[PDB]
Symmetry: D2
């Protein structure tokens, strides 16, 4: 068996927007992402799937059944997000705070108790109360709660993504506006102030790199505001760094609990030995730039004392690798591997690819954990790992294999504190809609019933034993190819 | 949930030759099938895989671990075979019995206590004692035991399959010789006499239709003696009928426990409505001919009182269908469906096909059960159902779907007394060797360790609850195609 | 054999931007499309392939070899475009013409001889002379020349597609600006004035529906300006209608030769009988709206005498169908058929799909020809038909099948005057770059050599005989599926 | 261009049994192969396809149209077989000849003019006259004729393959009987005596290695007599050696024209460098054993002066390779490459596989030619090369690639005198029936019409130019994989 420490957390991660709606009274129309996915032009263009989150899995109403399943599965932790748009559907700009802003730089944001009280008057009571209800229930199952403050949607008053898509950059511009940093610090303080008694650890945000990158660079991904603008991507990146740091400080003014961040990772593997330098450049550009900012205060060639040391732990999201080839002194991502595979194809390495076209590459998770650990020596939590797999064909192997790799990291001295699968149940996969099914539990979107995939039973074994048991260790292997789609050669 | 009666049996089936060998001291070289699969010409021709049973899963030595797994899985029954070749490695012809033989017809075989004693003197003691040991252990787990007397291999003294393949029909000729019927009655009496205290129900034989059909007609299948001879197929068929009837009588002279037979079934589905008559002709030729003989005494246009009423229950093996098309007043099996599909392909009905090229067709199991029930109203046991599936891609769906169909039969009044999956663990699939993996448990043929596939955990749910639970009912569905091999169009 | 009239034209079609560059001295950087495909953000986003037209097949320098091949193949016609950007790299706004503009409506544009002379002073001499050279050579081979004035790229002075993508709608805005209509009339007059002696028939433009639709609606296609704006799509559509009408008039003021238009067509086939109305709505929206404007003067619910009767012939481009399903009183295009198939997949109708994911549907060409003929009774020329097929797997069948369908139309009384394959040679497929290979001749982009695919030899048979000969008629069939990619199910 | 010498022959090869029947009056029921493929047990077993040669392409009646096509294609040679069964449907044993037989060894057979006259009295006049008619017509087209005496079927009076399959080895036993050697010498003399004026070169037999190997070893292939017997395979091999030598002598007693043999070849390629010795052992066993016998007189460890020097030229049949791995001091053929690939799959080398599962491996043809040339320095004729390819997907590439390799051999000094494609038209592929389509011309088996595949037009280019022309040289490449079936991984 491959045994984990007794305190090691096995759980799941979940987003508000992806999972909450679907039950009566749950609809939240007041986010950029909601507007974005309902936009007729986006739908007609195929930027978004045409599926809508209000037809989703209904965690808002059915949370007890989600928690029931998690408890039955032996899960001891959940990282779940709250939605800013629900809590502050109306603007909070007029709540005065003490913020030192020097042009593009937000150096501090102090949120007084008076401001918190004014925010409380402005907050949506049903929303914040409901979060307390859901998270209290969660805790009542013996599930440790990691609260993630931001998981992409912004209140519409902060971002009109259609206006921005259209190039009206005077419209509310989301992470292109330093105001959003300040409002986020306010929001983060407020949520900690309200909910801290339920929270074990905080994350400020989930995968900010996807926000800036898909929002402004990889615009075929259909993410808001889908405004192809490299400068904008950088501006959003910087504002997300600043938002993280200012939220860290605001939350720490309320609570001394650990405050971290959750980030989208790939293992950047060189196509050949000659591409090792290129792979390192990719890692820097795509990973260390953000972390060196919030850990070391290094951003854009200068060091900011107001950014340094603003991280207590690192949430590693990991799905697959990116294979990197040198291109001059730059680099390029090699198609056919990693995230760039044929959906339900096979990479040139012989690794099957998920329903999303993501390559089976568990070894990457060890590498990413090791690299983060060696660089910063901050505690690591695997905050996402999973697979789009409607058939549960690859998932059992995917699950055990990746858990094994976490064990390897642990054995080698990485302080990894848990593994959170993405996700307990199927949910709304953003621009892809509902057809990308990442759950251990299948969701019937008509009935809202949860259904256990066999991988859920495998995860129960792992979670209840805190081990890859002898019975299931064989799943630490690559899915046999013959029965799977071969894709195209 | 889909709930079964409290007495309903969930278990597994297993063959001696397929599962026993692999541990030291287990090798039994003294069967036709052993000679057959080691024959160099057969191997070179690709008639057999080149894999050998002595490299198998090792139930002979490791039975306790098989039983441990079954018990952990909640299984309440096992149908397991004994091997004639192990018990009587040397000829028993000289043991006198009272047999009325009129040419080709063996009308009676009475085995006296004196004969049983003489047989006991000739029997291999280690073999019979070891079977008692294994089956006693099996019973000690709360597992009901259905003993199946014959599961294809014959002692070599009864059948030199290489000589017969070569056309030397004066060599020991297996089921071409009425002597084999008589020796089988002796063997069956002997085994019942020795082991009855361990046995709940007896089966005389497993899939005799495969024996005669693959042995003498479908010779590319690589089954012994692989002597292409339609008359021989019929002769073997008749001798297997007679063997069944004479074993039934011999066993009943010792014990009043139920004595049945286990048979290979397909649902014969008409390609179009116009093929309904053709499908009925196929059912008669391939199924009712045997059963009308052993139930109604009807064979070859005449009725034999010595055949009538020689069946207490029917073991339904079922894997897939055969699609039938009229061809004149005859019929033909339509390729691309049923058993004749591309391995890991998809049929024209959109049904995925197993690693063996067998179509996903759970509805067939209901039909076969209903048809047997309507015709004979004898108790039915699903004695095999499973899938060759190295990845466990289709099996979870296959399992639940077929169990559901058994429930449907039950609900409609069919007396089906249990469901036995083929098989608990991977084993030697005859001419196909080890690459056809039917286990709920994967076998590592190097280490002999058993490994739980996720389907094993699903079956545990079913067996422990005697139900398709709400959590797993969704698996009563066709595996999603996109992620599976599409085959060729 | 399937024989065509002696005057029936067999030839090819070709675009300037797609085929001209690749030889020294050919580079034309002065178009929107050139800027667009070199734009770093577009490349990084995957909107465009990263391939560049200057690395193309080199018709500008190597035209004689293209013509040699066409002549060897027996081709009697070519429709080839000229590039506005080459001819007028600098703005022509200051050339005064008499234009009646009432807001959005350009009712007339008269281009005086004085204006033509002023244009001639402003024109790029090398460009216009070179076109004369190439087209004179073309004619010297016995090849009839259909000159197409516009095939998507605009001079950059008329359209800064990056500025528009960014939402700076005050930048030169291409078909969003009525000025472009007027400049196009000037350009069209100028080209006719210069080149008419070489021209048999004129087309004003190629597939304007792709320009407006991909430019402003189907923005994932990576066409300029990629500004998602439904109103803009309509504005561009109207301006392309007006441009067509004003070019028709301007060309007719110079020459009485036939002036037509070339349009992207699909056969809109109803998924079920219940979708017939929906299919008709699709045809109207996607086809009749434009043609009723330029034939009947009907646009936007009003009739314009300045639009009526502005068409002498219709160039039918046809590649595949679109399957249409009713959606309320609207309609939707059914994925998996037509243009929306898996690249190298197979549709649900069993029709193989090209390297572009376009379904094999030759019957559509008959339908489209018949429908146009029944509606307008204007002469039809199949101005494009071909397939992206790097292996020449489907093309031989595609070619003969579609030619057969043209014959069927002819036999039924449609005045179809010829068939022009897209294309003689591989070329730059817009945002897809060079990997979509439509040639009868394969191009080696390194050496610029032309290579005959077997389909070229089949087309030679057709063209030289003006018939589908007895030897090749069997190719009027669907490519056998077994050997082709099956795609995913 | 890749140019061949002016005398180099481009043509086709054809078998009597595979191509003759299908027209009224052509049916020849009097061969082992005819009986074999009509045998009900064989059909039911799937040993043979159920297709029958009498439904074939009808060369017997339609030869002029075959020749017309060949002439239109520019072909200058044909190797065509005659059928012993047609010429001597009744036994010729009673025609006395002078034969020195020492047990198994037939050391000489002298056929006197008197014997020839007696044979002529016994011959079927319609058959021999008809062959003269067909071959005279062939010659009238400028086509050089290579007559091949034997191409597998034997007269039934020499071989009752069903009796032998059944193990009745006292029945007429074909190549298991030295009598067949003697009768073959008689037959060969007779045919040369009758037809020599039409013949340029003789071949005694086609692929005798397939006869002995598939007949008695690879019995799943469904070749007669399908009697699994390694000793028999060796006996048949020796008798085919002897038959070749005695036919050589008998033909040389009549004519001094070149007498050769046609043999089934593979390039035996080592899987790794460590398998080079194993590959050499495979070549010896499968190729040099026969040729060292008929060239060097070396057979079974002894040298026979009556075998030495009995070969004037070597007919190389080549389709694909066999990949060989050492297995101890033996060797094994590696599945998934060469002849052992998935039909319409792709090998691990990335080479597409034909409809027969044969890997695209043109380099093998050079190797085989070079090896034969280096060993014996006898003139070589590529007597077969082609592909089962119903779609003509791979064939154009297959054709040009293999022709290129013949050129390479020539350039390197191999005396290769021509290239004969298998085949001009589709025909009956033995146990596989009609679905394996090897023609440059597709045959419609209903109408008997011949249809030109595009590869036929490519071959016309080659044959008329005696070159791989510049236009088609690109086809010397591997078919692009993306559009083809990927098979299974
Ligand atoms: Mg699975
Ligand atoms: Mg082709």
């Amino acid at each position: 068996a491959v045994t984990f420490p007794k305190d090691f957390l096995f759980g799941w991660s979940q987003a508000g927007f992806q999972s909450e709606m679907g039950t009566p009274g749950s609809e939240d129309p007041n986010s950029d992402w909601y507007a974005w996915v309902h936009d007729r032009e986006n739908i007609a263009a195929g930027l978004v799937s045409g599926d809508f989150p209000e037809n989703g899995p209904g965690y808002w109403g059915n949370y007890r059944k989600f928690h029931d399943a998690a408890q039955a599965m032996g899960l001891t932790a959940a990282r779940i997000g709250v939605e800013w748009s629900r809590i502050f559907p109306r603007p909070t700009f007029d709540v005065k705070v003490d913020a030192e802003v020097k042009g593009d730089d937000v150096l501090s944001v102090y949120v007084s108790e008076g401001a918190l009280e004014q925010l409380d008057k402005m907050a949506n009571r049903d929303a914040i109360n409901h979060y307390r209800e859901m998270f209290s229930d969660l805790r009542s199952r013996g599930i440790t709660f990691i609260l993630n403050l931001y998981h992409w949607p912004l209140p519409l008053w902060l971002h009109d993504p259609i206006a921005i898509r259209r190039g009206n950059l005077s419209a509310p511009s989301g992470w292109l506006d330093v105001r959003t940093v300040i409002e986020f610090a306010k929001f983060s303080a407020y949520v900690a102030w309200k909910l801290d008694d339920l929270v074990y650890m905080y994350s400020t945000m989930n995968e900010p790199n996807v926000v800036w990158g898909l929002g402004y660079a990889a615009v075929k991904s259909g993410f808001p505001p889908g405004y192809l603008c490299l400068e904008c991507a950088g501006r959003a990146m910087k504002n997300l760094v600043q938002a993280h740091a200012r939220a860290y400080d605001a939350v720490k003014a309320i609570t001394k609990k650990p405050v971290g961040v959750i980030y989208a990772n790939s293992d950047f593997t060189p196509l050949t030995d000659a591409d090792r330098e290129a792979a390192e450049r990719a890692k820097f550009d795509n990973r260390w730039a953000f972390f060196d900012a919030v850990v070391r205060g290094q951003l854009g060639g200068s060091t900011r004392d107001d950014l340094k040391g603003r991280l207590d732990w690192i949430g590693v999201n990991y799905y697959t690798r990116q294979v990197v080839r040198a291109r001059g002194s730059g680099y390029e991502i090699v198609p056919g591997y990693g995230h760039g595979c044929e959906p339900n194809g096979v990479s040139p390495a012989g690794r099957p690819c998920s329903d999303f076209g993501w390559e089976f590459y568990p070894e990457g998770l060890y590498n990413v954990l090791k690299e983060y650990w060696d660089r910063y020596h901050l505690p690591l939590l695997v905050t996402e790992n999973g697979i789009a797999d409607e058939g549960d064909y690859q998932r059992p192997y995917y699950l055990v294999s990746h858990v094994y790799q976490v064990h390897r990291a642990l054995q080698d001295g990485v302080n990894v504190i848990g593994y959170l699968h993405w996700s307990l149940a199927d949910n709304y996969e953003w621009a892809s809609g509902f057809s990308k099914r990442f759950g251990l539990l299948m969701v019937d979107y008509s009935t809202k019933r949860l259904h256990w995939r066999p991988s859920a039973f495998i995860y129960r074994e792992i979670a209840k034993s805190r081990a890859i048991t002898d019975e299931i260790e064989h799943l630490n292997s690559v899915p046999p190819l013959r029965g799977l789609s071969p894709g195209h050669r």
